[PDB]
């Protein structure tokens, strides 16, 4: 079987202390990245899951290891798909990293524990963000069943089925699994192949890249004579990248501080590409690929490349300070444990506006019926339209209000 990188981005959502990283470990094998220098930029893990089906039974055909000795048939497995995991945070404060991960994703995996309460505030907030940013391919997973009884787990299923009625998603598959015990993983791998079709993705579309994480490979003990370039942990949704192409990071750079700054987007050339495990020349869109650029390892250290757009040379994305948004408000607030009715937007108020991956604090200038004018403190770029989820300060930390679209 030939070595191939990620084809589709599949994420995992749940709640705190459930064990989302243990679920990722049970499916793939390699443990989470977060658990100082390398990887650390946004709260997300990295593990690649292998799907090889033995068609020489039913659900047990899709296996973790490529060599088939487990299901019964001595014949070797056939290549179907290779997937990448982008684990999103399940916390009320960490909202910008969740919405940044949702734009990267194409399919979702929901985790609800048996022993805990049925209506959870964070999972409903993740479900609302899925409905906003178009991620309808959702598989519901039960986290812990062995602590629960025979009838109580069935009653918990009935409460989940009654909860999913008014939402847009109608047909979502439900699987009972365990992370520590390691069971029924083969059924989930079967559902990933069947229920999720890969969207049409072509060579024709102009190259665009979204940077989430920042890698710097500087080793203790090793001298300055051998240095590695600043690798950007970015995700591609459109346009095929290869080795030896010019890249500009759009929003801007702070290098010089009376007067004015007149700086271009950060120019860099691709040196190395990191995909799956081994070195590869081509970058297939629909997966997290570590693009090793000429940009300094000091710039790709910690918290500098969190939600920044990248365009290829010969293309001009526009930089905006005043953005025109077409907003729609929900009935009641999602995320809070008391649920309150969403009030009308007041002029001049700080709101965390997440345009795909960019985290910006924006002030409302004019209030209308459907449209709103917003002024950004830090510049954010717009390419086409981009899916936006709005969040506001009402009670202590940030709470989601609704969805928005740029009309430019």
């Amino acid at each position: 079987i030939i070595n191939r990188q990620a084809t589709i981005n599949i994420g995992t959502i749940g709640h705190v202390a459930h064990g989302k990283s243990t679920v990722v470990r049970a499916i793939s094998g390699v443990q989470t990245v977060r658990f100082l220098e390398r990887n650390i930029t946004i709260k997300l893990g990295y593990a690649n899951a292998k799907i090889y089906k033995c068609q020489e039974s039913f659900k047990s055909d899709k296996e973790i290891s490529p060599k088939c000795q487990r299901p019964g048939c001595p014949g070797r497995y056939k290549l179907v798909r290779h997937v990448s995991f982008v684990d999103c945070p399940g916390h009320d404060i960490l909202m910008s990293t969740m919405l940044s991960g949702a734009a990267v994703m194409d399919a979702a995996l929901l985790l609800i524990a048996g022993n805990e309460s049925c209506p959870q505030p964070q999972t409903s907030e993740h479900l609302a963000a899925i409905e906003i940013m178009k991620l309808k391919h959702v598989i519901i997973l039960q986290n812990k069943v062995d602590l629960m009884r025979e009838e109580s787990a069935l009653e918990h299923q009935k409460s989940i089925l009654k909860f999913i009625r008014g939402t847009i998603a109608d047909g979502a598959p439900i699987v009972p699994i365990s992370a520590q015990l390691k069971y029924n993983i083969d059924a989930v791998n079967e559902f990933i192949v069947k229920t999720i079709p890969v969207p049409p993705r072509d060579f024709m579309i102009s190259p665009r890249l979204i940077v989430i994480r920042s890698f710097d490979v500087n080793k203790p003990g090793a001298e300055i004579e051998d240095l590695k370039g600043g690798v950007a942990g970015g995700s591609i949704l459109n346009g095929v990248f290869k080795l030896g192409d010019e890249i500009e990071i759009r929003p801007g750079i702070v290098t010089k501080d009376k007067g004015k700054i007149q700086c271009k987007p950060i120019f860099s050339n691709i040196v190395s590409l990191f995909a799956e495990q081994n070195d590869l020349k081509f970058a297939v869109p629909g997966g997290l690929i570590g693009v090793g650029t000429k940009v300094d390892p000091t710039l790709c250290r910690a918290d500098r490349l969190v939600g920044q757009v990248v365009g290829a040379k010969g293309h001009l994305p526009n930089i905006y300070t005043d953005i025109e948004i077409n907003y729609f408000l929900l009935r009641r607030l999602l995320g809070v444990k008391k649920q309150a009715k969403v009030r009308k937007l007041e002029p001049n108020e700080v709101l965390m506006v997440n345009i795909g991956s960019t985290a910006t604090g924006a002030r409302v200038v004019a209030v209308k019926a459907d449209m709103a004018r917003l002024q950004l403190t830090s510049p954010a770029c717009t390419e086409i339209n981009e899916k936006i989820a709005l969040s506001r300060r009402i009670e202590k930390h940030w709470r989601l209000i609704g969805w928005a679209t740029i009309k430019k």
Binding site: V145, D146, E150, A153, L154, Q157, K158, L161, G171, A172, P173, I174, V175, P176, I177, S178, L181, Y183, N184, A187
Partner: peptide, 17 residues
């Protein structure tokens, strides 16, 4: 969909430590 789920749950309860 909650029809093949009940067979998967019964398979899980049968094979436990």
């Amino acid at each position: 969909v909650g029809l093949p789920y009940s067979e998967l749950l019964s398979r899980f309860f049968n094979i436990l430590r």
